[PDB]
Design a protein around this ligand. Structure first.
Ligand SMILES: O=C(O)/C=C/C(=O)O
Lengths: 853, 39
């Protein structure tokens, strides 16, 4: 149902595929002929990949289950370390885990390492959420022995972060949050988390150097305490500093020992087990890498990749759980790519060798068993975890940051075709065409990534937050260009310093759609939770004029958002006191300089919260204002009765509300209300909150089934919200450019807003594909829109994938904020993807984008 | 399948009598090796 031909500027455009071989391949199985692993090795590694993704509450691979070794050795260390400073205890816990852990080496892999005792397993985190561990104990994936695991969880229960935080909130308030209806549950209750590791420090300095810095600081602090005359008001400050630095040393020494023991495993296998001489030599190379790295600075690309993977394991899995894969990978790896491929000074490599190495990275990430809670698996069907890396953008001078490492990263993604890790590309007008073409190759292949973030919008955002630095050491104007997405949508500093260390700083969701429901029912959530979800802001009779609805919502929003942030800052309070991260601290230049824990020191504020299903609440208010207080065709009681009846009757009434002006149609009346709602209520009331780091808290819109019937013409539990600031599914009816004009109207008090858009297959895969896409991106950027990501996949192939799943394994599509294999998503999710409007481009659309052919 | 490899006395993790217990395993995916610290 998409155009194959278009007349534009007196030129007839033939939307025929570039490669003539594509005309031969059936359209309903196109994406099964796109993968092309750079080597036989990476082809084997994909075929035998130990996938860790799950859907409908169970892992797709049968051997996937929880490990116990992390739980066991963390418990052992904690019992033994009683009485000692908590930072040192935490370091000792890490050290014991790393010292005693069974290590893993697999065939064919070059990047080595793992975070549990068995390559099919994932570790658990009793020190975080007792409830999360309890869930796994009551599942088919319980750590074994079950009795020991149960005893471990009971031991940790009063020590857990969850138990630390809960007493400082009304149990009724937490009960409301735990319903996950109007508010996402606080991170301390689920154990969910994120982090931006200071990789640059590890790769540049090595861990031995960090140990010597810490030991030097210890000596200086001890000397200060011994200096006459003693000053009790200043001298005691050295205690917490010394504690932190000693903990840094313990942590770093253990990571080095762990890495070297991993290298010893490679050497042992090469000399006693492996029979292939080619693999033997390779294992010995890897052994040497592990011996030097990360103890020493990296010298080449192989060093850097192994360092980065080791560091990822510690920061995201072993020291603590953290979702994500935040990093500026091209900029981070570039000096080591330069050493290896360009100058060939150390670990000489070809560009294709670099491509293969990135392929192997993507596969290792694909094998990474994530010990996130079961509840946070269900939200993302077909995925193992959210891994989002960032490339592109600009350097400190505002010049193009794109390079050949960027291209190697992008080609590897196009070749190996794995759902994870996803990629964010920071788009600037400065970005070279050579790299943009690689970006387009991935997108045109239907991968759903790279997702495009506005470079300037993120950079300015870093400058704005930097103003609120509590120690006046926020990001400089130059450092402001050094930013990555933390998870899906939110910008944050990357580098040796000032990076975000916890989801407590920013992250977490709130749901304006539900808050609108309970506004029209005295704070009572009848549709889902069946309880009092918010304040008794008055009955239906009290609500007079559209402002009362507009003002009752604010009261609900204020109550909800206040809990959303305070629960995060209370978590922060206890994270730095009982969940110290001395490894992360050791590799942060600020933490090392000041002798502070990673969660204590916060030089760059980055507070945010995610308003989700804002569009649904927005379109609902437009239909309320128009059809109740400006036409009086219906009363509040008639609407409320209809909503509670899920419009069993009132079918003409629902259509009347459905036909009301929507978002993403360049409709002046509809956009007028939604623009103010985004900037006055969603952002305005939220900005009034100051978080732990002394900065304001600003909204990050991104991504419904728990939302009851809303005046925007939605049936009960209808999950068809595209996400973020993107138009509701089937609401947009004036094309892509009209959608693009609506979104641009939101400019104030926002930190970010996700935009899903589906583009036509024949256009994108034609020779004209790149020109139109590049012009679209050009226009999107100049409209100052924060974000956009694309879906390039035909309905026919998805339908065929539903009928014969075993013939469409390599089909990858984009859902909310991540990509997944289509055959791994339940039918209901699949039908939701199909329902998304595939935007076609007319002559009028192309003229608006200022395209040229 | 349990092989013991005494930790070298110059290793960072060396202790008296410590060894790496290295076992080879293979399932439906492929081959791998496990190294567990023992005494
Ligand atoms: O942590 C979150 O909830 C979201 C993060 C992001 O969108 O970057």
């Amino acid at each position: 149902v998409s155009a194959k031909v278009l007349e534009y500027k007196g030129k007839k455009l033939n939307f025929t595929p570039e490669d003539p071989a594509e005309e031969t391949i059936p359209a309903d199985e196109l994406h099964e002929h796109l993968q092309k692993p750079s080597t036989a090795r990476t082809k084997r590694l994909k075929e035998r990949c130990r996938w860790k993704h799950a859907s409908a509450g169970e892992f797709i691979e049968k051997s996937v289950t929880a490990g116990i070794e992390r739980m066991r050795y963390l418990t052992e260390a904690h019992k033994a370390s009683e009485g000692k400073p908590e930072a040192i205890r935490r370091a000792l816990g890490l050290a014991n885990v790393l010292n005693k852990s069974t290590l893993v080496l697999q065939e064919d892999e070059f990047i080595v390492g793992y975070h549990a005792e068995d390559p099919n397993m994932f570790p658990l985190y009793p020190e975080l959420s007792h409830m999360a561990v309890q869930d796994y104990l009551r599942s088919d994936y319980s750590p074994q022995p079950a009795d020991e695991a149960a005893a471990i969880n009971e031991y940790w229960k009063p020590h857990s972060l969850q138990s630390k935080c809960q007493p400082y909130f009304d149990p009724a308030d937490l009960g409301r949050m735990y319903q996950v209806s109007s508010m996402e549950a606080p991170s301390f209750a689920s154990g969910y988390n994120s982090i931006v590791p200071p990789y640059e420090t590890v790769l540049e300095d090595g861990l031995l150097a960090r140990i010597k810095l810490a030991e030097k600081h210890i000596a200086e602090a001890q000397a200060d305490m011994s200096t006459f005359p003693w000053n009790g008001t200043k001298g005691l400050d050295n205690i917490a500093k010394i504690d932190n630095w000693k903990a840094m040393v313990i942590a770093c020494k253990a990571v080095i020992s762990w890495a070297r023991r991993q290298g010893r495993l490679c050497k042992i296998v090469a000399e006693n087990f492996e029979t292939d001489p080619k693999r033997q030599a390779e294992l010995l190379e890897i052994a040497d890498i592990c011996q030097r790295i990360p103890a020493e600075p990296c010298k080449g690309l192989k060093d850097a990749m192994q360092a980065k993977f080791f560091t990822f394991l510690i920061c995201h899995a072993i020291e603590r759980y953290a979702s994500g894969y935040a990093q500026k990978e091209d900029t981070l790896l570039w000096p080591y790519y330069k050493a290896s491929v360009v100058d060939k000074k150390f670990q000489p490599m070809s560009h294709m060798d670099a491509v293969e190495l990135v392929e192997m990275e993507r596969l290792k990430i694909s094998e990474h068993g994530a010990g996130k809670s079961r509840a946070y698996r269900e939200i993302f069907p077909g995925s193992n975890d959210l891994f989002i890396l960032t490339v592109g953008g600009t350097n400190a001078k505002g010049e193009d940051a794109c390079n050949d490492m960027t291209d190697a990263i992008l080609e590897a993604a196009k070749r190996i075709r794995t759902a994870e890790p996803s990629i964010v590309f920071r788009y600037s007008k400065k970005n070279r065409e050579k790299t943009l073409r690689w970006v387009f190759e991935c997108i045109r292949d239907g991968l759903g990534y790279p997702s495009i973030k506005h470079d300037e919008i993120g950079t300015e955002q870093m400058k704005e937050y930097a103003k609120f630095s509590l120690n006046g050491n926020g990001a400089t104007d130059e450092e402001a260009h050094n930013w990555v997405n933390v998870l899906c949508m939110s910008p944050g500093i990357h580098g040796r310093r000032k990076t975000q260390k916890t989801r407590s700083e920013g992250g977490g969701s709130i749901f304006p759609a539900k808050l609108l429901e309970i506004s029209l029912n005295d704070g009572y959530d009848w549709s889902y939770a069946d309880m009092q979800l918010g304040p008794k802001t008055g009955d239906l009779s009290s609500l007079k004029s559209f402002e009362d609805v507009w003002e009752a919502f604010r009261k609900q929003y204020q109550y909800a958002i206040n809990l959303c942030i305070s629960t995060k800052d209370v978590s922060r309070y206890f994270e730095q006191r009982f969940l110290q991260m001395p490894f992360v601290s050791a590799i942060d230049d600020g933490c090392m300089e000041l002798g502070m824990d990673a969660c204590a020191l916060s030089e760059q504020p980055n507070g945010w919260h995610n308003p989700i299903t804002t569009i649904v609440a927005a379109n609902s208010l437009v239909a309320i204002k128009k059809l109740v207080f400006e036409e009086k065709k219906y009363t509040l009681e008639q609407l409320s009765q209809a909503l509670k009846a899920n419009w069993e009757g009132f079918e003409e009434m629902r259509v009347d509300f459905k036909r009301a002006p929507k978002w993403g149609n360049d409709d002046d009346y509809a956009d007028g209300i939604i623009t103010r709602f985004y900037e006055e209520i969603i952002g305005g009331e939220m900005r009034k909150i100051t978080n732990y780091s002394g900065g304001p808290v600003m909204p990050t819109g991104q991504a419904g089934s728990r939302t009851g019937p809303t005046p925007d013409g939605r049936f009960g539990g209808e999950a068809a919200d595209d996400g973020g600031i993107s138009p509701y599914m089937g609401t947009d009816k004036k094309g892509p450019t009209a959608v693009l004009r609506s979104v641009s109207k939101v400019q104030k008090n926002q930190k970010g807003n996700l935009l899903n858009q589906r583009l036509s297959v024949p256009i994108m895969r034609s020779k004209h594909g790149f020109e139109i896409w590049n012009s679209y991106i050009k226009t999107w950027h100049d409209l100052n829109i924060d974000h956009v990501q694309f879906n390039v996949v035909s309905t026919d192939e998805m339908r065929a994938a539903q009928r014969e799943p075993e013939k469409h394994h390599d089909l990858i599509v984009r859902v909310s904020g991540y990509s997944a294999r289509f055959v791994d998503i339940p039918t209901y999710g699949q039908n939701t993807i199909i329902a998304r409007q595939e935007q076609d481009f007319s002559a009028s659309d192309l003229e608006f984008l200022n395209v040229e052919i | 399948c349990a092989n013991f490899f005494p930790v070298p006395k110059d290793a960072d993790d060396y202790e008296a009598g410590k060894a790496d217990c290295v076992r080879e395993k293979e399932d439906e995916k492929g081959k791998y090796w496990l190294s567990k610290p023992i005494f």
